[PDB]
Amino acid sequence: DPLVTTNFGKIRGIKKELNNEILGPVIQFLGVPYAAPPTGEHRFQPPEPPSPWSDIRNATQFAPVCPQNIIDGRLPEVMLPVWFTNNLDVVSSYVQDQSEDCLYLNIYVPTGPKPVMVYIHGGSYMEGTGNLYDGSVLASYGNVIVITVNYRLGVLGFLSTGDQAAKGNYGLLDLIQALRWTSENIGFFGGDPLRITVFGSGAGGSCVNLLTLSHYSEKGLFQRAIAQSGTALSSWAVSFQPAKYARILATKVGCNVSDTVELVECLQKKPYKELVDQDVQPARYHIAFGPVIDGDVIPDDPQILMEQGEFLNYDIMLGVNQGEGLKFVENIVDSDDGVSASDFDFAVSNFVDNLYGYPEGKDVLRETIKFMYTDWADRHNPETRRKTLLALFTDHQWVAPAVATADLHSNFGSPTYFYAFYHHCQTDQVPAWADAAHGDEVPYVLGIPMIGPTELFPCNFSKNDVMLSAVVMTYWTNFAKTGDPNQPVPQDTKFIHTKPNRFEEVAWTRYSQKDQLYLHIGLKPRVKEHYRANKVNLWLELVPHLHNLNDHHHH
Amino acid sequence: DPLVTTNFGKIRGIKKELNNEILGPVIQFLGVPYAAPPTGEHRFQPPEPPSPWSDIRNATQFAPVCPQNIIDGRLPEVMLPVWFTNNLDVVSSYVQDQSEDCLYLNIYVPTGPKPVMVYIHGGSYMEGTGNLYDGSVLASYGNVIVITVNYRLGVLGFLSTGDQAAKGNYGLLDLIQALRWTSENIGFFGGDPLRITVFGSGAGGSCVNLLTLSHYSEKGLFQRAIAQSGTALSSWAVSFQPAKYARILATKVGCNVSDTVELVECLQKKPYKELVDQDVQPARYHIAFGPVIDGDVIPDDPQILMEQGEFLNYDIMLGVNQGEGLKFVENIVDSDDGVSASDFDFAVSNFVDNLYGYPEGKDVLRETIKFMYTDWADRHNPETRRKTLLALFTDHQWVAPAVATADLHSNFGSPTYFYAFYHHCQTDQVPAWADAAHGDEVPYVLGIPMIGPTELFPCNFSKNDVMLSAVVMTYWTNFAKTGDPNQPVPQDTKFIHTKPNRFEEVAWTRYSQKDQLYLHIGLKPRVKEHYRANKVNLWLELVPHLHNLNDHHHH
Ligand SMILES: *[C@@H]1O[C@H](CO)[C@@H](O)[C@H](O)[C@H]1NC(C)=O
Ligand SMILES: *[C@@H]1O[C@H](CO)[C@@H](O)[C@H](O)[C@H]1NC(C)=O
Ligand SMILES: *[C@@H]1O[C@H](CO)[C@@H](O)[C@H](O)[C@H]1NC(C)=O
Ligand SMILES: *[C@@H]1O[C@H](CO)[C@@H](O)[C@H](O)[C@H]1NC(C)=O
Ligand code: NI
């Protein structure tokens, strides 16, 4: 009978055996309230502490998830993890039970104080749940406590009128409240509040970075951050026109009045289902509801905050996957796995126009970008065209921003580590020609290969996948334990790996803007330098110069 | 007693043994007049046939060379072959005996009709002599007749008033006259007038290409062309402001009168040395005296003629050397063999402004070129900077023009072959870090390694140099024999090679604009595709687009 007494009352967890003969069991505390329900007058308001209870509260099953709709095709596939979009039937079972009363977290405890890794999920800020990420294997394997969190999503978590009526960022404030709850109560579970690492993939990674830029993350709250395939600098990390979308939403539900306070009060009267089901489309590659620059939680544009080093110095780990942008080209690839020269020019031109605006003069940007992403040493290959087009989207939305983020963190003294993920397990839902796509590193970080194929992750993981997952978890948990991916657990070959550990002699060197060393995570691992340096510098150095040659405007 | 009766009279040659035990001797006919002396009223006039003689004329020693000055530092080192500029003391001995009466050619005959290879020398159109190129080894080894030619140089060979007073191109007309003489008389020496191949390096290669664009090269005159490191499309292949320089020269010698006919008549009265010794400097990277677009010999801009396929369909072979542009950077390299970021920016910017003119608006060209030639994967390496800067000059002045030439020839049906020369023998006069420079292929084509170091080519040639020279001569002479570098002599290993022939299994595939297959000539030979495709397309496609973004002007 796993009982723990927290500052709010006694809680009962549940022991769970893992589907691996080597891994020990864990104790799970599911559906733990970390804040009061954000309902009634508390909708569109910062989270309040949870109410205490006098008996023993059971935490043996997941609590309802935050309101969302993932079955009507409103989800931006180019932004969400492929494992999620390709397995909607299973994902749906995890979010079938919903409620506005959804501020709960899950704790996985292995059977001195242990490091705590807090996972922040996120695809587009509109959907998901930490419940989708089983932290059992990571906890048991790395001997760390793993926590998954549910924070307010979409409209309920991010609506903002651009003024005092609704300041936005409720979902981020929930994450901060979950971190405060953890800091104050995890010791009761055997956790170390002085060694808290927050990690997340995709929009979850964006959340991680945004938290490091907020003064609400007081010194000492958490110590390290791991942002996988997600930054605060991408076009879809922040909502820059919140008021516009708040009013479009209001108009659709019959609440669009002149006064913003009355508008919000009206929205607070609506059944949450009504707000969630409306179709509010943002510009392509951008978001409608999400983090906003309120001047308080998020003090200014993240780019400015980063350039000016407006963040505490956490230990930082970040990276990207070889082929993040799969969904960007998957639909235009012909039956021969190739992309035509015409589809290529069309795709590149439209992407540039949406991100940089239409030129009011003679174009130079589109012409230059098409030239740069054309393999002149093999310009006739339709498959190579597919590859370079995919690389363009990957470089622009993930690689460039990640490098810009790494450069600034190291420049300002944050111990930084960078990785490029070049491995994955292909399911029957992904093209045979595809490389690791957005979200593909998640199963490895969570140790799914160690417990075999699951409903959520059905790929038939190989022994090499198990070995690689073990390697990744060792680096990730070493980082959680010391802020150094190499300490204290060496990369050795043990029965758990099932195959020789190919990283035995690979020390993950710290990243610096000068050498830019990074870990190439794959079956042929090694530390390399200047990840895709040519394309990264094209986007960060040359393009801005060319962009300023003309006046541009959007629509 | 080597006697031959030509259409103009009997000529006596001289037998010559070669410094190689395997090679047979050759009969040399040196100083054979192929035209009448272009003196008096014949200065600045097309060449006339030579006068016949009734006795036996001796052709056992070189005739005086055409007027020139190579000792006062007026020679543009960036344009001339390195072996020439680095060994002026020896070169000077070959041009010490000069005369305006200089239209003579040299014939090398091996001891059915044999193919004839006519070598056209040329550094900047102002200096040199075919006498510098001993065709003995090529003739003996390949069993072909080799001819070297002396044509009018500099002022005497190319002065033009831009009108009828002096139409220019006298030196080119001399080459045509030498080819006509060869066509009509080489059979008397055992040569085949139906298999005449013209070849040349540097400005000599430019001459070769210009001849293919002239209507004066009537169908049947010659059948094949080999242009080594030289085209008719480079900035220094043609003189575009002839009148301007004709008048600057006239002013310097006291002949600048208003009437162009009177100006020319005055120049015709001057001692040739007076015209040769004047310092007439053209714009950097351009020429003052050289081929001009007269609308007759050269009907229009070579670029236009090439785009429109205005040339007969010859068998063509063309190529470039790995590091042509050595002299462009050699002087700015520090004692550490590197180039600073500042010197790099300065060199690139100045080169671009000279070739493209100064922009009258915000620059885009300089910024883009600097970005393209920066190795972002090793941006801190000063030696890499040296290499990329050298590559920039090489790509622009030699590679791009050669590829443009090859593409057009193949597009219009000319059987085309392309090579990249990646081997050389370093003398103690060139930097240890340098790769094959401009003119470095000459010793190999001429078989110099077979006879050991010479006064002109003092490098201590290795066994591999001998082997490679043998390989090159086989490809070149096979081309002369059949128009196909692979027939009829196979690339086998014989005692003459001294080392195993590394090209035994390397068939030189024909070049096409689609596959752009070329022969990589080096110690690790093989046919490759799309030589430096990225940089070539940058210059041929992207740059022209960026150039048109602004109005540009020169000074
Ligand atoms: C809590 O769980 C216990 C053990 O399964 C059960 O007996 C009880 O009915 C549940 N509800 C509570 C909190 O009493
Ligand atoms: C909501 O009302 C305001 C003021 O009446 C108006 O400006 C706005 O367009 C309306 N919202 C929309 C987009 O329909
Ligand atoms: C030509 O060469 C021959 C043989 O060396 C020599 O006898 C003669 O004097 C030379 N002069 C001429 C033109 O006969
Ligand atoms: C030569 O004379 C002409 C006309 O008298 C003049 O235009 C030209 O500038 C003179 N040549 C030079 C460049 O000195
Ligand atoms: Ni000017």
Side-chain angles (χ1 to χ4, degrees):
Chain A
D1 193 31
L3 297 177
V4 172
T5 302
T6 72
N7 286 325
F8 301 95
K10 308 180 189 303
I11 191 73
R12 167 178 293 117
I14 181 174
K15 180 179 180 179
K16 196 60 54 187
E17 291 292 324
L18 288 57
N19 190 52
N20 181 292
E21 297 188 3
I22 294 176
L23 299 178
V26 303
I27 302 301
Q28 311 179 335
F29 295 84
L30 311 179
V32 182
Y34 68 81
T39 60
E41 70 183 308
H42 295 296
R43 173 184 287 177
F44 305 134
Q45 281 291 285
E48 292 297 317
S51 295
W53 55 87
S54 54
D55 44 34
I56 294 178
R57 184 191 175 87
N58 291 324
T60 58
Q61 64 181 54
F62 290 129
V65 300
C66 296
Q68 58 190 276
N69 186 319
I70 68 171
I71 59 179
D72 77 320
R74 67 178 61 193
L75 43 75
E77 302 194 319
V78 299
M79 196 179 165
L80 305 178
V82 174
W83 61 257
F84 184 108
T85 54
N86 286 349
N87 197 11
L88 240 37
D89 281 355
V90 176
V91 177
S92 282
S93 67
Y94 281 80
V95 299
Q96 63 183 305
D97 183 26
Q98 303 178 15
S99 177
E100 178 162 31
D101 177 345
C102 64
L103 302 185
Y104 301 83
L105 52 79
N106 311 299
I107 309 172
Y108 298 86
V109 186
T111 59
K114 305 178 186 304
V116 182
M117 295 183 75
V118 181
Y119 189 75
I120 304 178
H121 84 85
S124 69
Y125 298 117
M126 309 295 296
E127 73 298 280
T129 169
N131 304 358
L132 284 160
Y133 310 80
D134 193 330
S136 298
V137 177
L138 180 57
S140 183
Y141 176 85
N143 192 32
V144 298
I145 288 174
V146 179
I147 296 172
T148 60
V149 185
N150 286 286
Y151 56 94
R152 277 174 282 178
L153 305 171
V155 176
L156 296 174
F158 301 97
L159 180 144
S160 174
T161 50
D163 63 12
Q164 303 302 293
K167 291 182 271 290
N169 296 321
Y170 309 111
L172 294 181
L173 289 173
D174 293 334
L175 290 169
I176 284 162
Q177 171 61 21
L179 291 174
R180 293 185 188 298
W181 185 95
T182 298
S183 177
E184 292 170 17
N185 295 274
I186 206 59
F188 300 129
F189 294 83
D192 185 357
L194 294 182
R195 292 190 293 167
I196 297 178
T197 296
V198 294
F199 68 132
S201 179
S206 297
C207 283
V208 169
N209 288 111
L210 289 168
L211 289 178
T212 63
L213 302 175
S214 180
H215 75 279
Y216 278 74
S217 297
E218 77 261 54
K219 203 175 197 306
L221 186 55
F222 60 101
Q223 297 64 42
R224 325 186 211 287
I226 302 176
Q228 306 162 195
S229 301
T231 67
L233 308 181
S234 54
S235 61
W236 48 43
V238 172
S239 168
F240 285 85
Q241 299 177 296
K244 173 190 176 181
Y245 293 111
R247 283 187 174 291
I248 289 178
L249 180 281
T251 297
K252 290 173 175 292
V253 300
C255 279
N256 195 57
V257 294
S258 178
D259 182 283
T260 55
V261 172
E262 289 181 357
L263 180 157
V264 175
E265 299 186 315
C266 179
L267 294 180
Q268 290 178 304
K269 288 291 198 306
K270 297 292 186 177
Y272 74 75
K273 183 74 170 184
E274 176 79 357
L275 305 184
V276 177
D277 294 325
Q278 300 311 311
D279 296 304
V280 182
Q281 256 54 288
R284 272 207 301 183
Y285 311 121
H286 296 76
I287 57 171
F289 299 106
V292 296
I293 299 167
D294 67 306
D296 181 49
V297 179
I298 302 301
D300 209 327
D301 188 312
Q303 187 65 58
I304 297 175
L305 299 177
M306 285 303 296
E307 292 296 345
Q308 292 182 17
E310 296 285 60
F311 46 84
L312 300 175
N313 284 307
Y314 307 83
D315 293 314
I316 302 290
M317 175 183 292
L318 58 179
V320 295
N321 300 348
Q322 172 171 30
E324 302 270 10
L326 176 60
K327 293 297 178 177
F328 176 67
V329 308
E330 186 173 61
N331 207 188
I332 62 176
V333 176
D334 59 44
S335 61
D336 293 302
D337 306 331
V339 174
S340 63
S342 51
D343 282 332
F344 172 92
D345 300 314
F346 182 67
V348 180
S349 299
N350 300 313
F351 179 69
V352 177
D353 291 335
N354 277 85
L355 275 294
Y356 294 84
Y358 305 79
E360 301 180 3
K362 300 173 285 61
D363 168 78
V364 55
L365 264 180
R366 297 191 302 258
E367 202 59 42
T368 301
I369 298 304
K370 288 184 292 182
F371 170 81
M372 294 301 301
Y373 280 91
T374 291
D375 185 348
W376 298 105
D378 183 37
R379 67 178 191 289
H380 307 300
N381 201 311
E383 285 187 285
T384 303
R385 201 166 300 136
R386 176 201 74 223
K387 301 178 186 299
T388 62
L389 181 59
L390 199 165
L392 188 166
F393 196 72
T394 297
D395 292 341
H396 195 284
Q397 297 303 88
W398 284 277
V399 190
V403 172
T405 297
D407 283 349
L408 287 168
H409 261 292
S410 54
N411 282 332
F412 283 102
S414 299
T416 305
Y417 295 86
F418 197 98
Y419 71 83
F421 208 82
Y422 277 54
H423 186 65
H424 69 300
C425 187
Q426 67 173 62
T427 66
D428 301 315
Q429 302 302 301
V430 304
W433 50 258
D435 294 309
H438 186 59
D440 278 340
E441 87 291 354
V442 171
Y444 295 91
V445 171
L446 298 183
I448 302 304
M450 287 193 182
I451 52 176
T454 62
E455 288 182 53
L456 192 63
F457 297 102
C459 199
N460 284 303
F461 297 108
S462 67
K463 286 184 175 296
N464 277 321
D465 285 316
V466 176
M467 177 276 294
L468 192 286
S469 178
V471 167
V472 169
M473 291 192 288
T474 289
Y475 281 133
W476 263 232
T477 60
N478 267 354
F479 181 72
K481 297 165 182 177
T482 68
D484 182 335
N486 305 291
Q487 302 302 324
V489 184
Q491 288 289 359
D492 299 311
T493 297
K494 301 186 176 65
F495 286 113
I496 192 69
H497 299 83
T498 77
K499 272 197 179 303
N501 184 328
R502 303 187 180 187
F503 296 68
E504 289 201 14
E505 296 310 311
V506 182
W508 192 342
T509 318
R510 281 183 56 170
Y511 178 104
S512 67
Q513 185 180 57
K514 194 273 279 56
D515 303 302
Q516 300 179 312
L517 297 176
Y518 69 100
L519 178 65
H520 175 94
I521 304 177
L523 293 181
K524 293 185 178 180
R526 53 163 169 157
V527 168
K528 302 182 184 186
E529 60 190 7
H530 310 292
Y531 187 61
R532 296 186 63 72
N534 292 160
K535 295 301 186 300
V536 168
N537 283 287
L538 163 66
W539 291 116
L540 299 184
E541 309 240 318
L542 185 59
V543 166
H545 181 282
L546 303 177
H547 194 201
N548 187 58
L549 294 175
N550 281 299
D551 289 305
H552 293 247
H553 64 270
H554 296 67
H555 286 294
Chain B
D1 199 5
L3 299 177
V4 171
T5 301
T6 72
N7 285 326
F8 301 94
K10 296 181 295 298
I11 190 72
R12 168 178 293 115
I14 182 174
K15 184 188 186 64
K16 197 57 53 187
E17 291 284 349
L18 305 184
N19 188 49
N20 182 291
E21 295 190 2
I22 298 177
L23 299 178
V26 301
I27 303 303
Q28 310 178 335
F29 295 84
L30 311 178
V32 181
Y34 69 81
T39 59
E41 305 184 8
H42 295 296
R43 172 184 288 177
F44 305 136
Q45 283 291 286
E48 291 299 316
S51 297
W53 55 87
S54 57
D55 44 28
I56 294 179
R57 186 193 172 86
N58 290 325
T60 59
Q61 64 181 52
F62 290 128
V65 302
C66 296
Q68 59 191 276
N69 187 321
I70 68 172
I71 60 180
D72 75 324
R74 65 178 62 192
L75 42 74
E77 293 188 359
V78 300
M79 193 177 169
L80 307 180
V82 177
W83 60 258
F84 185 109
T85 54
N86 285 350
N87 197 13
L88 288 178
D89 294 315
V90 177
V91 177
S92 284
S93 67
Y94 282 81
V95 299
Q96 62 184 305
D97 184 25
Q98 308 180 9
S99 176
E100 188 167 14
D101 178 342
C102 65
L103 301 185
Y104 301 82
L105 53 77
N106 310 297
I107 309 173
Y108 298 87
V109 185
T111 56
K114 306 177 186 304
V116 183
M117 295 182 80
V118 182
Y119 190 73
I120 304 182
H121 84 86
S124 70
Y125 298 117
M126 309 293 299
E127 72 299 281
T129 170
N131 305 358
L132 283 161
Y133 310 79
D134 192 330
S136 296
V137 178
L138 180 58
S140 181
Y141 176 85
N143 192 32
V144 297
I145 289 176
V146 180
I147 295 173
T148 59
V149 184
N150 287 285
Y151 56 94
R152 277 174 282 178
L153 305 169
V155 175
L156 295 177
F158 302 96
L159 181 139
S160 175
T161 48
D163 59 30
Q164 298 302 71
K167 295 186 277 291
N169 296 324
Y170 309 111
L172 293 183
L173 289 174
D174 293 335
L175 291 170
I176 285 298
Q177 171 60 21
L179 291 172
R180 295 188 192 297
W181 185 95
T182 297
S183 177
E184 299 173 3
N185 295 274
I186 205 59
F188 300 128
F189 295 82
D192 187 353
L194 294 182
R195 292 190 293 167
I196 297 179
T197 295
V198 296
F199 68 132
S201 179
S206 295
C207 284
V208 168
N209 287 113
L210 288 168
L211 291 178
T212 63
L213 301 175
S214 182
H215 81 71
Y216 281 78
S217 297
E218 72 280 359
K219 188 167 183 58
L221 186 56
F222 60 102
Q223 297 64 42
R224 323 187 214 287
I226 303 177
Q228 307 163 194
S229 299
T231 68
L233 309 178
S234 52
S235 63
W236 47 44
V238 170
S239 171
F240 281 98
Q241 311 179 74
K244 169 189 171 60
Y245 294 111
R247 283 187 173 291
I248 289 177
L249 174 72
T251 297
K252 289 174 176 293
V253 301
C255 280
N256 195 58
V257 296
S258 61
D259 186 75
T260 54
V261 170
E262 291 183 1
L263 179 158
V264 175
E265 300 188 316
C266 179
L267 292 178
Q268 292 179 300
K269 295 282 186 170
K270 297 292 188 177
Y272 75 75
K273 195 53 184 171
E274 175 78 350
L275 306 183
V276 176
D277 293 326
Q278 300 311 310
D279 296 303
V280 182
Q281 282 160 289
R284 213 177 190 186
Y285 310 122
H286 296 74
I287 56 172
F289 298 106
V292 297
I293 300 170
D294 67 308
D296 185 19
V297 180
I298 302 303
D300 203 345
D301 190 313
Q303 187 64 58
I304 296 175
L305 299 179
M306 285 302 293
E307 291 295 345
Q308 292 181 22
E310 304 287 0
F311 47 83
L312 297 176
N313 280 146
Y314 306 84
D315 292 317
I316 299 96
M317 175 184 289
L318 58 181
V320 293
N321 301 347
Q322 171 173 33
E324 301 273 5
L326 176 62
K327 295 296 180 175
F328 177 67
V329 307
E330 190 175 65
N331 194 52
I332 63 173
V333 177
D334 58 46
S335 61
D336 285 343
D337 300 349
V339 173
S340 63
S342 53
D343 283 340
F344 174 91
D345 166 44
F346 190 70
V348 179
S349 297
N350 190 286
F351 179 71
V352 176
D353 293 332
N354 288 308
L355 276 293
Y356 294 86
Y358 304 78
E360 285 171 40
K362 291 115 67 179
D363 169 77
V364 55
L365 259 182
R366 298 192 301 257
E367 201 62 43
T368 299
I369 298 304
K370 286 186 291 182
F371 170 84
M372 294 300 302
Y373 281 91
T374 290
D375 186 348
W376 298 103
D378 185 43
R379 69 178 191 289
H380 307 299
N381 200 311
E383 295 192 63
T384 300
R385 199 167 301 142
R386 178 200 73 225
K387 298 187 188 61
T388 64
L389 182 59
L390 198 162
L392 187 164
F393 196 73
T394 298
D395 292 340
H396 195 283
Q397 297 303 88
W398 284 277
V399 189
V403 173
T405 297
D407 284 346
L408 285 168
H409 260 294
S410 53
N411 285 334
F412 281 104
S414 300
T416 306
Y417 295 86
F418 198 99
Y419 70 84
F421 208 81
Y422 277 55
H423 187 68
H424 69 302
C425 185
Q426 294 196 306
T427 65
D428 49 44
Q429 299 301 302
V430 303
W433 50 257
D435 295 310
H438 185 56
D440 276 349
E441 85 292 353
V442 173
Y444 294 94
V445 169
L446 295 184
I448 301 301
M450 292 202 172
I451 52 175
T454 61
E455 195 165 304
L456 187 60
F457 296 104
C459 198
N460 292 303
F461 296 110
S462 66
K463 285 183 177 295
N464 276 319
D465 283 317
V466 175
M467 177 276 292
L468 195 141
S469 180
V471 168
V472 170
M473 288 192 288
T474 288
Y475 282 133
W476 263 233
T477 60
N478 267 354
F479 182 72
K481 296 166 181 176
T482 68
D484 183 330
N486 306 292
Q487 302 301 324
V489 183
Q491 290 290 357
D492 296 309
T493 296
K494 301 183 181 299
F495 285 115
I496 192 66
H497 296 84
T498 77
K499 278 295 190 67
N501 186 328
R502 303 187 180 189
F503 297 68
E504 273 192 50
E505 298 308 310
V506 180
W508 192 341
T509 318
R510 186 164 162 177
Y511 179 104
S512 65
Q513 185 178 56
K514 186 177 67 64
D515 303 301
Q516 299 180 314
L517 296 176
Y518 68 100
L519 178 65
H520 177 94
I521 303 177
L523 291 183
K524 292 191 182 64
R526 64 195 199 75
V527 170
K528 302 183 182 186
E529 49 178 49
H530 311 292
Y531 187 61
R532 295 185 63 72
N534 291 155
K535 294 300 187 299
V536 168
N537 187 278
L538 161 67
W539 293 114
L540 296 184
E541 289 191 46
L542 184 58
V543 166
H545 182 282
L546 302 177
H547 195 200
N548 186 56
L549 295 178
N550 284 298
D551 288 307
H552 291 247
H553 62 270
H554 296 65
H555 288 295

PDB file of all heavy atoms in Angstrom, chain B residues 358 553-555, ligand 5:
ATOM      1  N   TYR B 358      30.364  48.521 -60.105  1.00  0.00           N
ATOM      2  CA  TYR B 358      29.874  48.953 -58.802  1.00  0.00           C
ATOM      3  C   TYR B 358      28.361  49.124 -58.845  1.00  0.00           C
ATOM      4  O   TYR B 358      27.819  49.715 -59.779  1.00  0.00           O
ATOM      5  CB  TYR B 358      30.531  50.274 -58.391  1.00  0.00           C
ATOM      6  CG  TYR B 358      32.041  50.219 -58.385  1.00  0.00           C
ATOM      7  CD1 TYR B 358      32.762  50.300 -59.574  1.00  0.00           C
ATOM      8  CD2 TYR B 358      32.749  50.050 -57.196  1.00  0.00           C
ATOM      9  CE1 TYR B 358      34.149  50.212 -59.582  1.00  0.00           C
ATOM     10  CE2 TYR B 358      34.140  49.962 -57.192  1.00  0.00           C
ATOM     11  CZ  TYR B 358      34.832  50.042 -58.391  1.00  0.00           C
ATOM     12  OH  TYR B 358      36.205  49.940 -58.405  1.00  0.00           O
ATOM     13  N   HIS B 553      27.916  50.103 -62.906  1.00  0.00           N
ATOM     14  CA  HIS B 553      28.776  50.837 -63.827  1.00  0.00           C
ATOM     15  C   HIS B 553      30.236  50.583 -63.476  1.00  0.00           C
ATOM     16  O   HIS B 553      30.566  50.290 -62.324  1.00  0.00           O
ATOM     17  CB  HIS B 553      28.480  52.345 -63.807  1.00  0.00           C
ATOM     18  CG  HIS B 553      28.722  53.001 -62.484  1.00  0.00           C
ATOM     19  ND1 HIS B 553      27.750  53.098 -61.513  1.00  0.00           N
ATOM     20  CD2 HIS B 553      29.827  53.596 -61.972  1.00  0.00           C
ATOM     21  CE1 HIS B 553      28.243  53.726 -60.459  1.00  0.00           C
ATOM     22  NE2 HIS B 553      29.500  54.038 -60.713  1.00  0.00           N
ATOM     23  N   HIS B 554      31.104  50.678 -64.478  1.00  0.00           N
ATOM     24  CA  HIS B 554      32.531  50.460 -64.284  1.00  0.00           C
ATOM     25  C   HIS B 554      33.288  51.780 -64.324  1.00  0.00           C
ATOM     26  O   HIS B 554      32.711  52.832 -64.600  1.00  0.00           O
ATOM     27  CB  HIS B 554      33.089  49.546 -65.381  1.00  0.00           C
ATOM     28  CG  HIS B 554      32.522  48.161 -65.370  1.00  0.00           C
ATOM     29  ND1 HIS B 554      31.193  47.898 -65.622  1.00  0.00           N
ATOM     30  CD2 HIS B 554      33.109  46.962 -65.150  1.00  0.00           C
ATOM     31  CE1 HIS B 554      30.985  46.594 -65.560  1.00  0.00           C
ATOM     32  NE2 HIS B 554      32.132  46.003 -65.276  1.00  0.00           N
ATOM     33  N   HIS B 555      34.586  51.712 -64.051  1.00  0.00           N
ATOM     34  CA  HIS B 555      35.450  52.887 -64.076  1.00  0.00           C
ATOM     35  C   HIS B 555      36.719  52.581 -64.859  1.00  0.00           C
ATOM     36  O   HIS B 555      36.911  53.196 -65.928  1.00  0.00           O
ATOM     37  CB  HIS B 555      35.815  53.309 -62.657  1.00  0.00           C
ATOM     38  CG  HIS B 555      34.679  53.917 -61.903  1.00  0.00           C
ATOM     39  ND1 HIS B 555      34.104  55.115 -62.268  1.00  0.00           N
ATOM     40  CD2 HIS B 555      33.995  53.484 -60.820  1.00  0.00           C
ATOM     41  CE1 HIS B 555      33.113  55.394 -61.442  1.00  0.00           C
ATOM     42  NE2 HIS B 555      33.027  54.420 -60.553  1.00  0.00           N
TER      43      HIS B 555
HETATM   44 NI    NI C   5      31.239  54.883 -59.672  1.00  0.00          NI
END
